[PDB]
Every structure is written in C-alpha cells, then in structure tokens.
Assembly symmetry: D6
Homo-oligomer: 64 residues x 12
C-alpha cells in the first residue's frame, strides 16, 4: 500500500492533490501549515500535506 | 445519541454543518483551526469542527 | 449578579454584544480567539468573548 | 507619575492613544495582541496597549 | 561600534531602516513581530527590528 | 557540496531562489516564517529559507 | 448529578480524593499539575484534580 | 482488532501493562505524561499510555 | 479589602503563608512556579503565590 | 547505510545503545524525552533516541 | 544606579547573591531557570538571576 | 578565533568543559537542556552547551 509521497516535496498543493488521488482514489486530503500541532488518531484514508508560506509541499506527505 | 461524524473528514465546512444539523438539530457548531488549544468544559449541544487551511474538515467532529 | 452567558454559545459577536449589554449595561466587551493566552487580572466590568474562525461565540462568556 | 490607564479598558486604540498622549506627552505607544509574549526590559517612556481582535483595549495599559 | 538604537523605539519601520543604514551602511535589516522565537546565531552585519501590530518599532533594535 | 548561503541574509525570496537554483539546480525550496517549528527529517535536495514579515531572508539558508 | 467541588480548593489530594469518592463512588481520579495541556474527550466517571507544587488542589475539580 | 482500553482509565501503569499485554501480546508499551507533544507516525504494535502525576492512566490507551 | 502583598516579594513561602493568613484568615493559598499557565476563573478566597527555584516569592501575590 | 532502527521501539536505552553501536560503531548517541524540541542541523554520526518516562525507546531512532 | 551585572555571567548563585547584595543592599533576588516565561511588571528592588542546569548564572542579571 | 566544537558532540559535560577551557581559557560555560528557549544577546566569552537527559553534549557547542 502506498503510504508516502517523497516525490511531492517542493511541488504545489494542486499538483500534490492530483498525484495523491491518482495513487489513492479514496484519499481525504488535508492541507496544514508546517509546524501545526497535530494530536490526531490514525485514519488510513487521510493524507495530510504540510505546506510552506507559498502553499508548496514542505515535508513528505504520508497516510494517516 | 450521535456523537461523532467520521464521514465528514475531508468535506467542506458547509457540507459538515448541513449534515451535523440534520443529525443534531440543536447543534451549536464551532469552527476552529487544527491545533487550537482547547481548554473547554463539556457542552452536549456543541459540535467543534477542526478545519485545515482550506476550511475542510481535518479531524472527526465530536459532540462536546 | 449575572456572571455567565451559556445562552450565547454559537451565536454571533453582534448578537452576544447586544445581549450582554442588555444584561450588563457597563460591560467592557473584549473579543479574542479561542486559545488565546490570558494572563489577566479580574475586572468586574469586563466580559471576554472567545470566538471561532467565523466570529461565533465558542465558549460561555463570563465576567472578569 | 501616571503609570496605568484602567479607564481605557474597552476603548479603541485611537481613543487610548489620544488619552495616553494627553497624560504622557513623551509616550512611545506600542500596540500588541493580547497573549503576545513579551520578554522586554523596562522603558519608562513606553506604553504597551494589548488589544483584542477588534483593536479594542483588552487589558489595563501600563508604562514600561 | 554602534550596536543599539534606543532612539528608534516607537518609530516606523521606514524611519528605523533609514536611521540604521545611516549608522551602519552594511546593515541587513530583518523585521519580525514581537514575540517571535529566535533561535539564531550571531551576525555582526544583521539588525533585527521587532515590530508591533502597526509596524512600529517595539523594542530597542540591536546588532546580531 | 554547497550547503549554506550566508550571502543571502537580507535578500528577497526571489533573489534567494535564483541564487540557490544556480548553485543547486535540483533544490526544492521551502519558504517558512522565522520561528516555525520544524520537526523534519534530512533531505539533501531541500533548502529551507526562513523569512521575515517582509519576505526577506532572515537566517542563513542551509540544505536539509 | 454532582459535577463540581469548589469546597476542595486549597485542600490536599488525599482530602480531595476522600470527598470526591464519598460523592461519586465510581470516580476515576486523575491528578495533574496546573497548566497541563489537556486535549481530552469527556468521561462522565473521571474527575481531574489540578494541583499546585505542594499537591494542594488549585482549581475547582469538575467531572469530565 | 482491539484498539482501545477505556477500562484502564484510572488504573496504575502496572495494571494497564498487564491487561494490554494479555489483549495484545506483541504490544510495545510507551508511558508518557499527559500533555506530551506527540508528533509520531502510526505503529500498529505500539500502545501509548498517558499518565498523571501519580502514574495512573489518565486517558484511554489506544494503539498507534 | 486587601488584595495584594508587594511586601512579600523575595520572602519564603512559609513567611508569605503566615502573612497572608494574618491578613486574610479564609485564604486558600496555592503555590505555583513562575510562568505557569493559568487559565483560571476568579476566586475571592484564593491567593496564588508564584515562586522561584528556591521557593521564594517572585511576583506580588494577589487575590483571585 | 543503516539509518533507522524500528526494531528498538519499546526497548530500553541500554539495549538500544548496544544495538546501535553494533550497527554504527561511530554513533554519537543522544537520549532525549519525547516531545523535546529539536532545532538541530544534520549530523551523519549522531543518533537521537526519544524515550518515555521509563527510559524506554518511544519512537524509531534515526540518524541525524 | 547599578542596573546590570555582566561580571556575574558564569558564576554561582551564591557568588551572584553576595555581589548583588554588596551593590544593592535592598535587592530581592529571584532565581529562575533560563527560558522561564516572565510576564512581570517592573520592580526597582528586584533582581532576577537566570540560571543553568548547574545553578550558574547564564545571562546578565538586571534590575526589574 | 575558535567558535565551535563539533568534536564534543556525544561527550560528557566534564570532558566538554575541559576541552573548551583548553581552547578558550576565559570561557564562561553554561549547561542547558536541549530545547531550552534562548532569547539571549551575544557574549563573546560565553559557551553554551546543550545536553541530553544523560548530561551528554547533544549539539555543537558554539561561542555566544
């Protein structure tokens, strides 16, 4: 099962969403600033994308 | 009593509000950024929705 | 002496202000985001309202 | 020496500035959000005003 | 060597920049909100200016 | 291998990006506010730029 | 249903536990330092006691 | 698959460990203070237990 | 009504407690480290004392 | 090059150190509480181990 | 008026206290860990000393 | 001028102090936990050492 998207570091939110949904059609994509504190439980259908000030992907997106 | 809405993860605030009010007509719906610190008491009529940068539901909304 | 306004959870800032001033004509109403850190002293004429992202009342307003 | 302005709680920044400068013509007035962390040294000519989301004075302004 | 600018407390960013560059032509001027956390190393050509909500200088600018 | 860009302190994001990509054509450039908390792993192709309120480079950009 | 114990402010943990269990025999009593950050869900059988440096009750214990 | 242990709220670490290992023989049990910030990835064999000042279980232990 | 004890800055907890109880026989005295975050409501019978590493009073004790 | 030690989650510091040094004889092993904030640069010879209240490994140790 | 003690950086608490009281007989000396958050008002008779893990003076003690 | 001690990562406080004082006889050595927040000014005679739970050097010691 695909769980990580290193290839998306540096790319835009739009490009990330497109790629993640090709790979994971059920993905529930959540867009948060880097450094956001995240007390969450694990959701196998969720993919969190941490973005910079310019809404580029700053860290490897991972399922959960 | 309905207490959680896992089906709303990833959906918009508007869609969440609509669904929560169908299920819980008395709901007092509060919209906060993920990571907001929450020193609150329990209110059975309140539903907090934690949203991402795009005002999508990021975490399962729960009564309280 | 009226000290709390549970009836205002979920309502707008405008509606809250109107109700608080009917009940407490001398009120000095302060509007802050939920989670704001509050190292304050007690002021009997002040009412702090903690609001969500949509400027709705998120927590019971209390004198102080 | 005037050091505090309790009478300004709840008032606007503009009204606060006007009153503080009548009382303290040399005042260097600094406007910060409530909860801002303040590791400062003491300046006798400075007056910090802590304001709410609506740029109303939320706490008693004090010299320093 | 000039290392501090107490005379700039309360002044605008534009006035501060002008004065700092007259005094220190090589200055690399960085503008940050008060309370920003600053884990930095020492740079002799840098001057950080901490500003309030109105982009006025809130604290004595210092080299480093 | 070039790992740091001290020469970019004080410069704009646009100038920084241009210089970093001349030096490191594969760079994945991420733009964050100073003070952002950064729990990241090491990526040799990434360069994080920490910027001030005016989107000037505030700290030496480094690979990772 | 008893939900708060104002009478226990200032008392020891031992005295608090004794009183809470007389009033609420099923209580699951949790002892935390004041200021502890509490991202919890509501448990009707739990009573959190916030204590000072001397393990005295510092704030009104409440169910949840 | 057992994922939560509500029955352990209020119990000691020793009793929790015993019960979790009966239910989940492969469990890797981690004991942390309530409020600890937890930027972790999901591990299906891990169970985190959040404890109070007296090393009693303060919150429902969950796999991850 | 006595509300503040400036005379106790620098004194020990034991001396502070003695003086506060002479002045305020009903006082519920709470001892916390400086910097403790305090999201509390106002209690007219409570006096919080903020202490240093040596359990000396570091800040003016005040009712509330 | 070995960069991660998932097999050490849940084990003691002593066992972790032994295993990491078998795999990486030059390792500079650093032991920190979970949640410690880590503004560090990348060191290829360092391995940070994040431990729980009982000095067990709480998270996968990684080079850097 | 003596307001700072640069000569005490690196010295013990005992040596600092001795020197500060020679210079300032009325000093109310408060000993805090580095990084302690300090929302205080200005007291001309107080001297705060910020100490390291070994109770050595880590930063220049200053009146206030 | 020696400004950094990479060779001391992983070593004890005692060994670090010995080496730093051989290299810098005037050093004022300050020992702090990793993650300590450090709002300091630059002191050319100071060397801060950030240590882990076992009082080993966790990060490169640097003058300032």
């Amino acid at each position: 099962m695909k769980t990580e998207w290193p290839e998306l570091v540096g790319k835009s939110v739009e490009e990330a969403k497109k790629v993640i949904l090709q790979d994971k059609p059920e993905a529930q994509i959540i867009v948060l600033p880097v450094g956001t504190i995240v007390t969450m439980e694990y959701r196998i259908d969720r993919v969190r994308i941490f973005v910079d000030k310019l809404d580029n992907v700053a860290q490897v997106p991972r399922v959960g």
